[PDB]
Amino acid sequence: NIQGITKPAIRRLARRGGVKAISGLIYEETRGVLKVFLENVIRDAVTYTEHAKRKTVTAMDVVYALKRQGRTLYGFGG
Amino acid sequence: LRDNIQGITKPAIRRLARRGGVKAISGLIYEETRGVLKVFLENVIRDAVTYTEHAKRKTVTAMDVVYALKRQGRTLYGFGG
Amino acid sequence: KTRSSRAGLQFPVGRVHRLLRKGNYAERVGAGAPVYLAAVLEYLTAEILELAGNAARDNKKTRIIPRHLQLAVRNDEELNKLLGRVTIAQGGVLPNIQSVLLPKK
Amino acid sequence: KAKTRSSRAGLQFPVGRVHRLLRKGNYAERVGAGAPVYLAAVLEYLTAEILELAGNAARDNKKTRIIPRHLQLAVRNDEELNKLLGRVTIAQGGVLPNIQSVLLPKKT
Amino acid sequence: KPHRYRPGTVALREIRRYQKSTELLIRKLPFQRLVREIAQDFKTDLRFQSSAVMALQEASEAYLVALFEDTNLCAIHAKRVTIMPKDIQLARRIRGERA
Amino acid sequence: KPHRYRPGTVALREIRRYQKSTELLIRKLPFQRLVREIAQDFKTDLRFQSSAVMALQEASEAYLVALFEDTNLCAIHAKRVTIMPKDIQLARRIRGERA
Amino acid sequence: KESYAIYVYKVLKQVHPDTGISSKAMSIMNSFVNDVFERIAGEASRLAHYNKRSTITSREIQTAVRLLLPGELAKHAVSEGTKAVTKYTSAK
Amino acid sequence: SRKESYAIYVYKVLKQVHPDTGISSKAMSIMNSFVNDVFERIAGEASRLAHYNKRSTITSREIQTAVRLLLPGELAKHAVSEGTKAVTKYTSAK
DNA sequence: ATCAATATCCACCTGCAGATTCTACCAAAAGTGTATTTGGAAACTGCTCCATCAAAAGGCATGTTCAGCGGAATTCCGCTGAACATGCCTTTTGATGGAGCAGTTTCCAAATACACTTTTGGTAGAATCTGCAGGTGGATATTGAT
DNA sequence: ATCAATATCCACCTGCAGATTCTACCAAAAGTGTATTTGGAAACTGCTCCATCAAAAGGCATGTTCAGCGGAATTCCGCTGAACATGCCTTTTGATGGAGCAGTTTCCAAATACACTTTTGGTAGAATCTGCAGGTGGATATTGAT
Numbered sequence A: 001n002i003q004g005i006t007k008p009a010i011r012r013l014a015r016r017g018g019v020k021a022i023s024g025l026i027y028e029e030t031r032g033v034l035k036v037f038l039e040n041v042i043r044d045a046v047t048y049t050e051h052a053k054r055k056t057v058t059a060m061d062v063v064y065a066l067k068r069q070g071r072t073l074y075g076f077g078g
Numbered sequence B: 001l002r003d004n005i006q007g008i009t010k011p012a013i014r015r016l017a018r019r020g021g022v023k024a025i026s027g028l029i030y031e032e033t034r035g036v037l038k039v040f041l042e043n044v045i046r047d048a049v050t051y052t053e054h055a056k057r058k059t060v061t062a063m064d065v066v067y068a069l070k071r072q073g074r075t076l077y078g079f080g081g
Numbered sequence C: 001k002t003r004s005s006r007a008g009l010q011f012p013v014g015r016v017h018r019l020l021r022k023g024n025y026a027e028r029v030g031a032g033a034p035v036y037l038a039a040v041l042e043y044l045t046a047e048i049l050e051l052a053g054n055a056a057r058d059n060k061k062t063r064i065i066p067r068h069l070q071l072a073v074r075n076d077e078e079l080n081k082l083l084g085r086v087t088i089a090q091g092g093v094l095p096n097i098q099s100v101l102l103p104k105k
Numbered sequence D: 001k002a003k004t005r006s007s008r009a010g011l012q013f014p015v016g017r018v019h020r021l022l023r024k025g026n027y028a029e030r031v032g033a034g035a036p037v038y039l040a041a042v043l044e045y046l047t048a049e050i051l052e053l054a055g056n057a058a059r060d061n062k063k064t065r066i067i068p069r070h071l072q073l074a075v076r077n078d079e080e081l082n083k084l085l086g087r088v089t090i091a092q093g094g095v096l097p098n099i100q101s102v103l104l105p106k107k108t
Numbered sequence E, F: 001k002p003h004r005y006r007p008g009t010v011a012l013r014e015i016r017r018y019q020k021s022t023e024l025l026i027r028k029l030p031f032q033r034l035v036r037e038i039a040q041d042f043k044t045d046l047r048f049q050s051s052a053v054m055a056l057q058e059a060s061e062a063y064l065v066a067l068f069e070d071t072n073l074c075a076i077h078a079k080r081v082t083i084m085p086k087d088i089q090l091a092r093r094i095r096g097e098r099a
Numbered sequence G: 001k002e003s004y005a006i007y008v009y010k011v012l013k014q015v016h017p018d019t020g021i022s023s024k025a026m027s028i029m030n031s032f033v034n035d036v037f038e039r040i041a042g043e044a045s046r047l048a049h050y051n052k053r054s055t056i057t058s059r060e061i062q063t064a065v066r067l068l069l070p071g072e073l074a075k076h077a078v079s080e081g082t083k084a085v086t087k088y089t090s091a092k
Numbered sequence H: 001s002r003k004e005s006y007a008i009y010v011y012k013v014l015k016q017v018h019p020d021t022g023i024s025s026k027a028m029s030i031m032n033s034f035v036n037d038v039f040e041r042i043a044g045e046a047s048r049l050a051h052y053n054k055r056s057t058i059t060s061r062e063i064q065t066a067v068r069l070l071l072p073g074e075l076a077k078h079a080v081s082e083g084t085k086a087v088t089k090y091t092s093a094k
Numbered sequence I, J: 001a002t003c004a005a006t007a008t009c010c011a012c013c014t015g016c017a018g019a020t021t022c023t024a025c026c027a028a029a030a031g032t033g034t035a036t037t038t039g040g041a042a043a044c045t046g047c048t049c050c051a052t053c054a055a056a057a058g059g060c061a062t063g064t065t066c067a068g069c070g071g072a073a074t075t076c077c078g079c080t081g082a083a084c085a086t087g088c089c090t091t092t093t094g095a096t097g098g099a100g101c102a103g104t105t106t107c108c109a110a111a112t113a114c115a116c117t118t119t120t121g122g123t124a125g126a127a128t129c130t131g132c133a134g135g136t137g138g139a140t141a142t143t144g145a146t
Helices: A009-018 A026-051 A059-068 B008-018 B028-053 B063-072 C003-007 C014-020 C034-060 C066-073 C077-082 D005-010 D016-024 D034-060 D067-077 D078-085 E009-020 E028-041 E048-076 E085-095 F009-020 F030-040 F050-077 F084-093 G005-015 G023-051 G058-070 G071-089 H007-017 H025-053 H060-068 H073-092
Strands: A073-075 C087-090
Touching: A009 A026, A009 E009, A026 A059, A026 E028, A026 E048, A026 E085, A026 H060, A059 A073, A059 E048, A059 H025, A073 E048, A073 G023, B008 B028, B008 F009, B008 F050, B028 C014, B028 F050, B028 F084, B028 G023, B028 G058, B063 F050, B063 G023, C003 C014, C003 C034, C003 G071, C014 C034, C014 G023, C034 C066, C034 C077, C034 G023, C034 G058, C034 G071, C034 H007, C066 C077, C066 C087, C087 D078, C087 E009, C087 E048, D005 D016, D005 D034, D005 H073, D016 D034, D016 H025, D034 D067, D034 G071, D034 H007, D034 H025, D034 H060, D034 H073, D067 D078, D067 F030, D067 H025, D078 E028, D078 G058, D078 H073, E028 E048, E048 E085, E048 F050, E048 F084, E085 F050, E085 F084, F030 F050, F030 G023, F050 F084, G005 G023, G023 G058, G058 G071, H025 H060, H060 H073
Parallel strands: A073 C087
Antiparallel strands: none
């Protein structure tokens, strides 16, 4: 699954980041980062899901999560 | 009270870089450092004093500073908070 | 007549007051705090919309969208700072390429 | 004879003081009875965890009285405590001795 | 007669292109797959509002893109123009995400 | 006596020295004056509990030390061993103090 | 499901009567206000607690705003804020 | 004005872990700052937690989630144990 | 390597500040005991909207090739660390006036707490309406090879 | 400079997704009028601790000489990432049972609230107590020249 995050896409991301050249070793180093990012956020949102005794992670659970990770997001109510 | 930022002597700045594990310091580091410090303080003192004023006091308490520090996400332990 | 009207505001003084109480921010709430706050919120709302609205104009468009709000915010020192830890969905990024990355001559 | 709540809970920390602070902190309309108990517990646990580690640093420096340096040592040397207090500054705690390799002399 | 573009010329073009648009850049299904997998580790038989996955992707991309910004800066500090692992590492460290 | 340590030998000696201790490294009075001055060319007739002046200094130094590490890390990234202004810059840039 | 949208829209016209706003845009604008509400209410809560006050008055909102807003922004913010209360008091 | 502190409790606990070890006043000060910080932090998440759910009461349950969200993996693990543990004991008495 | 110049690590030694220990007043807690209120888990229900299955779109994976980029090696010199002499100004000790922080009593504007009434923002199932996403064409600029 | 293979740009066109003007419904607001309550300003003031000023003195800052190392610039090789064209497998997109999230109601276990009784955590505070900071000599490293 993490491999589903393709080089083409990782490349696209870099590009928006203003990156002109990329060392091959970057795609894997990148996924690890993305994995850790999601784990942190998802762990927190799902915790909110349990506290609310639901089996569905809601956009708000994520929003709250992000807020906690110090990464406020706009466009979903939080 | 005028050039007190120069009270931050080269030696002091070197000592600081040492604790930081810095082995070599370019000659231009010191003024860059004073600049950075000045901003740090201004940002902290500003708020601190804002807390003082709100409390209608003339004296800046250490709590003023503690709260100021926390606002900036630079939480300090050892002075009541 | 409503308090927003007495205050000359477009924002819900009453609602704000209500939300402040439901906030559990304090045991009591001054009569004017809801007013003052409503005032501040409206203002900043106006502040952005203005810039975002200009953003749309420059884009030859008339309906504001995230990209216009992103351009509005990151392009203004203050707003950009006030929202420095905030992420706007579908906003993109300010066009920018490190000089050293451009070809010679 | 009346038994304190901390007592009923098997705790050294103040269940009563805490319950009280929860109310004045105005974090919600009401505070259930377990809240102060549980919180004090957690609080008491955490301070015990750090004191364990601090007192050790104290030991490692032939000292008997813990000082801030010990606290700093205790914390920055423990992964989680260090994470938990990642944006916290302990006055008079110094830093952990650490030097970058490239800065050491010679080779081999 | 074959027309070929020199190295970096298409890249710069891409940079220009993408800094101008805003579409998410990772493919949905793959993403949703990744999220659910990670989450499946925290709790079983879960479900996600479409909006929650979307929130996440929106947030991750913004995250990664910014991280590429600092990364690209660390490369340039090193007088390079090719971002490398060490660059992402350094950035993340100074960010307080690493150690 | 014509004895002379090679350059960098003392520096390391100094790093081990200071990283071992905990006292503040900025002269107490001078720092106090700087505080007064700033607070003043900022708001008149103010007073300070010494503890307040000391809180500021403990903070200030903790901040500066922590910064130098990031800086020192940037120099190295650039295969240097001498920190230069551009290093402090990059750190603060990525830190989020000017980027 | 409450939201500032309606009010947001009003303020919009007042500045760009001919400009419109997409759905997503509106949502964001809402997230914005909710955010700033929280931030300002937050510090205002704190200030009172520090001072052993049990009431959050405009006084707090003001100091709170000075503390939370950038230079010039905080300037107008206060002006606007003070106007609203002034105009509000003077009224039957 | 009788300014309160946790210092006597820290001290008890201190004696439990290292019975022959003492603590300087500055150190006690830091320890005090430590406790209040965590207090605020947990109570804070607690606060929001309840709010997010339209609950007016903060319970041991909201402290628990709070502790989970706030503390690093391992610590939370043990935090909950002592926490759950104190509650039940308190609950069984009387 | 031998060796001289030094920094360093260590244990013993003990005045002294900073910590542990206390008698004692004690106000403010914290606890015990009813009386009254209520938040919120439960069980039952319904209509979202979400996971799942199928089908047409539209990337992504791939191997080839070579340009151009990192970094190794070599060099010039500028500049930063070390060492030393000089003496300034921070530090330490103290004593002091008095600013202003902080404790207490008093009482009034402002806030809570219903009660009763009027209003509005949210939602919905409907209908007309519109800004602009892209799709075409043709002119013009950009890039790259010769 | 010379094509020319392409990418980029502009003006125009159109339909449809998503914005909008719509009439209705109504519970939840939000406002109004009444009665109760209390937070916290004002005024008097106890008293902590902040600014200040003195004076002695050495720990440190300043300023300089000077040489070597580390930064910076140039050169050059060969490793590898960018550009492509190639082949097609996965993502995207529209359709349908039902898992739940969410609305509504119930009654009790648990949280206010007001009343007394009681224990404790704080502290001025004179007393007592003791880890260790700081001065010390000497046995043991570590550096750097030869």
